[PDB]
Amino acid sequence: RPDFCLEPPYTGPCKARIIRYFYNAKAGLCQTFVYGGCRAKRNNFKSAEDCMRTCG
């Protein structure tokens, strides 16, 4: 898998309430997190399917 799949989820500093998906390598699956709408890192997907396709 790409090494960005190992990053902790990153909310960033902005105030939005956007549900995104990150890969949790210890758990071996994607989970949801709240992204704040700026400064997204790479481990940040718009669906579980894209997250698992990229990082599974």
Lay out the secondary structure:
Elements: E1 18-24, E2 29-35, H1 48-55
Antiparallel strand pairs: 1-2
Function: Inhibits trypsin, kallikrein, chymotrypsin, and plasmin.
Subcellular location: Secreted
Site (Reactive bond for trypsin): 15-16
* Count of helical regions: 1
Q: Report the principal-axis shape.
A: globular
Compute the separation of the termini in Å: 7 Å
CATH class: Few Secondary Structures
Sheet with the most strands: spatial strand order: 1-2
Rg result: 10 Å
Helix share, percent: 10-25%
How many domains? The number is: 1
CATH H-level homologous superfamily name: Pancreatic trypsin inhibitor Kunitz domain
CATH topology: Factor Xa Inhibitor
Q: What about the largest sheet?
A: 2 strands, antiparallel
SS elements, strand count:
2
Estimate the strand proportion: 25-35%
Secondary-structure element order, N to C = EEH
The CATH architecture assignment turns out to be Irregular
Structural class: alpha+beta
PDB class: hydrolase inhibitor
Keywords: aprotinin, sucrose octasulfate, Disulfide bond, Protease inhibitor, Secreted, Serine protease inhibitor, hydrolase inhibitor
Assembly: monomeric
Entry title: Crystal structure of aprotinin in complex with sucrose octasulfate: unusual interactions and implication for heparin binding
